[PDB]
Design a protein around this ligand. Sequence first.
Ligand SMILES: [Fe+3]
Ligand SMILES: [Fe+3]
Ligand SMILES: [Fe+3]
Ligand SMILES: [Fe+3]
Ligand SMILES: [Fe+3]
Ligand SMILES: [Fe+3]
Ligand SMILES: [Fe+3]
Ligand SMILES: [Fe+3]
Ligand SMILES: [Fe+3]
Ligand SMILES: [Fe+3]
Ligand SMILES: [Fe+3]
Ligand SMILES: [Fe+3]
Ligand SMILES: [Fe+3]
Ligand SMILES: [Fe+3]
Lengths: 172, 172, 173, 172, 172, 173
Amino acid sequence: HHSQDPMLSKDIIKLLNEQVNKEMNSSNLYMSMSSWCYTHSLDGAGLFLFDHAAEEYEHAKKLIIFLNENNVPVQLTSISAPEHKFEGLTQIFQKAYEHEQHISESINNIVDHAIKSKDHATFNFLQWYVAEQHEEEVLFKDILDKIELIGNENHGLYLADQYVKGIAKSRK
Amino acid sequence: HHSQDPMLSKDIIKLLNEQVNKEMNSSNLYMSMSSWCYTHSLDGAGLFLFDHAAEEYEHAKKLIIFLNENNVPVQLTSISAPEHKFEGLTQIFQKAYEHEQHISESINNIVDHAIKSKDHATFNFLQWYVAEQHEEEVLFKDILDKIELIGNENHGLYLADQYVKGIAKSRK
Amino acid sequence: HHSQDPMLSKDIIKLLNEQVNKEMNSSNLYMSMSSWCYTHSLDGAGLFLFDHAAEEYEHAKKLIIFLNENNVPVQLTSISAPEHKFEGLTQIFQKAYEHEQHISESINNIVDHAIKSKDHATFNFLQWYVAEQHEEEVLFKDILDKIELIGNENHGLYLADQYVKGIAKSRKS
Amino acid sequence: HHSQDPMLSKDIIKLLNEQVNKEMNSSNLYMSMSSWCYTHSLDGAGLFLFDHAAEEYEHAKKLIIFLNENNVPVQLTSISAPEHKFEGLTQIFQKAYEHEQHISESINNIVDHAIKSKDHATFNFLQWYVAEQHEEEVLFKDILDKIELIGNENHGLYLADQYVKGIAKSRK
Amino acid sequence: HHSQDPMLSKDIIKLLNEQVNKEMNSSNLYMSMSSWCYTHSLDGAGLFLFDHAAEEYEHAKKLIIFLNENNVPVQLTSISAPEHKFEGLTQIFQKAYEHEQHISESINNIVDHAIKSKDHATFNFLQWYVAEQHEEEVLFKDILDKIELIGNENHGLYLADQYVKGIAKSRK
Amino acid sequence: HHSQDPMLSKDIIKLLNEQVNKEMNSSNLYMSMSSWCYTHSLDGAGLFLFDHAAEEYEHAKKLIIFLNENNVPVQLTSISAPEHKFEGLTQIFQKAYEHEQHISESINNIVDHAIKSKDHATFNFLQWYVAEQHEEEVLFKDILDKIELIGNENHGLYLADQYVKGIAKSRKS
Ligand SMILES: [Fe+3]
Ligand SMILES: [Fe+3]
Ligand SMILES: [Fe+3]
Ligand SMILES: [Fe+3]
Ligand SMILES: [Fe+3]
Ligand SMILES: [Fe+3]
Ligand SMILES: [Fe+3]
Ligand SMILES: [Fe+3]
Ligand SMILES: [Fe+3]
Ligand SMILES: [Fe+3]
Ligand SMILES: [Fe+3]
Ligand SMILES: [Fe+3]
Ligand SMILES: [Fe+3]
Ligand SMILES: [Fe+3]
């Protein structure tokens, strides 16, 4: 039997499949960072990063759904194991904020390509994704700002972890 | 500051970490199988397999939670691209059922090791997982049974896909 | 058309089928005991044993369901005519308690075999059955204890039967 | 202590005790037929026949209750192992319909004996049983009629099983 | 009058009776640790440890119930006076965590003996106890981790006690 | 860091700590009595005595709470192994009633000491304990009266146990 051709262009297909794998890598990275926090008595950060990792997989699932609906084959690729060794809470959140900046950049790029190739179905679809990623990038900026304000001096790690714990709980 | 040592034995840690990675791999496989179905007009099987893939990630998360609570570092390994080429609906579910048999075996192995090393916290924890995996293995057996009963002659693929669609919706 | 092979091992299949037939045999034994009581003015014990017999059939059905879901053919055997002649209420409950002890042992044997064969699907499935059988064994122990505490002196049978009647009614609701 | 004699005649006692054993045998036959269906991918018929087997045991229990209330000793004899060899879905339902015909005949016989004996307590008691058996005989006639209407050609068994599955669920 | 013999084996009887006495001893230890905290201005830890002591007595009662139902005589031996000399909050929780580890080991031992003896009534019974003990061991690990993360420098004891006070109230 | 001194006098502290240990000892005695009953087919008395044992521990906890709030160190002593061999239901309740009489006396002694030392915080605190202990002493008197009225002639033990079972159940709800 005959099935209809993919409804998206080759360039958009490539960028979207790359994005699915980027989100899966993100989930892995954040699970690893979370585990580091959990094994170093920082369960506030552990919980926050675990929940964030899960949300990254949710992004991957939403991108996959869009690919499926357009008759576009999903291309799940090989991905390196995430980094597992970290220096401390500050370094983790510095690395995470940088990572979010990079993800934001990657989304901006696809949206720009949608405009260029007049793919406004894809432009329209990606708007939840632009909005949600901006929120996440702002969130990591805010957490990093707070960790740096508190500092590492006497009880500082505890104070920072409890602050992140509060955010983790409030974000359901 | 000092954090407490991992609360599980080296062998159990190894087996549980391997299992996390197995479930992550399973999620990728099922996403790939789902995509094949969606791009070959089998959206019933597409939906069922997508939802099943998501459930495998849920298993991985629950295993991670148990590792975290026991102060056991999560060791996420490199991701290898899942199989993406398939012959048809029957072959997909034959491969899936075989995969589920393998997963059941892997769980039986961990539970047996928990008994052998007198790790009854782990034994007790794994019981939801034994129960749920059994349900999944039976489900795949039943779907494969139905696909083979229906056949492949005129309208057969359609009837099978609609049957699987019904199951997918009922499990929501 | 091809159907999938049985999902359980040959040894586990045989034990579970044997257990189905054990529960069916138990149901008949208890119906016969129940009838003896009813025909000897012991309707409290009659009701208790009737309801217990019915619960044994429910156990058989639950085991059959598990076999069915695993693509395991159910093998129902001949059921021997149960004992029908009894000496009295005490003898019936002595026999019943001994029977319950045997059933408990038979379950322990299957669960042990599941562990040894690494069949944790079956191990996990049987836990409701282990728990419910333990409660049943304890119940028959308690009833036997009570019958023996009361005795058959002046109104003893009546008192014991009423005691059992109360239990029967409480287990309904 | 003296207990009152049985309240029913020797002939009625014999017939009712035989009926209890007939219903128990029926339950076993239906469990066996059910198992055949389940192990041959016909879970619609499997469920239907399982639920029917349980209903036949319910009939046995109700007959036992009536014997008990009349101070009539219940005489359970050996219950021979049921047939387990079956050719297919049509043959199972052909055998089942014929079996239900025999059961209907057995009930008619007891009711006639009650009339002849002027045992109107028993006549009146059996009315639920006459009505329920009639409904069951009609039901098996209808299912067999449908299995034969559908036939075994391309997807026929699947359609028949799904039809019977519908009936099974509606009688829950 | 004759009463039925104990329903459990001699080895299982010994182990369960020893466990009752262990739980009673644990209750006393925790009451003593609780009192130390209360009399040293650590009422958060005082409340937590008091409530924990009461929970250990609840475990003793549940084990006693199981012995009673099996016609097994309860053998209460002398319960030696608990340690009352403590150095500080960290030492108390270090000792507590080590104590919970020992309790976990004792339970694993009984469950293993039940398996070896084919006593699955006892195995099945103990599952609530395995699960609840695991949660308690994890909890003490977490509290100790937090006490050590905070430390004893300026306001450290106060912060740790308030943290434990929070946990105490949340478990009510 | 400095914590405030105990808020109660040395003599009151000692009496209250002794009372904590008395209640813990009582709990164990009653658990042992309860077990004897359960293992001799007297589950009514078994349940009653088990629930009573648990209530004694609750008394110990309430006393500990008072000590804690007054910055008084709790001093838990060794608990001797309770008596475990008994002659029968009557002897158990004779022993229990005598025990309750002793507990009542021990409370009277503390309350009297509180009055003499002008410790009315402690006097006031103990009033729930005086009241609850009186109700307990009366209850054991009543049960003993009933066991002795019934006796052990033909079905006597059964009747007495069922009577106690009814009390046990009524005190739950
Ligand atoms: Fe993000
Ligand atoms: Fe994102
Ligand atoms: Fe699975
Ligand atoms: Fe799984
Ligand atoms: Fe049984
Ligand atoms: Fe049973
Ligand atoms: Fe019928
Ligand atoms: Fe019928
Ligand atoms: Fe058709
Ligand atoms: Fe504990
Ligand atoms: Fe414990
Ligand atoms: Fe500070
Ligand atoms: Fe008292
Ligand atoms: Fe008292």
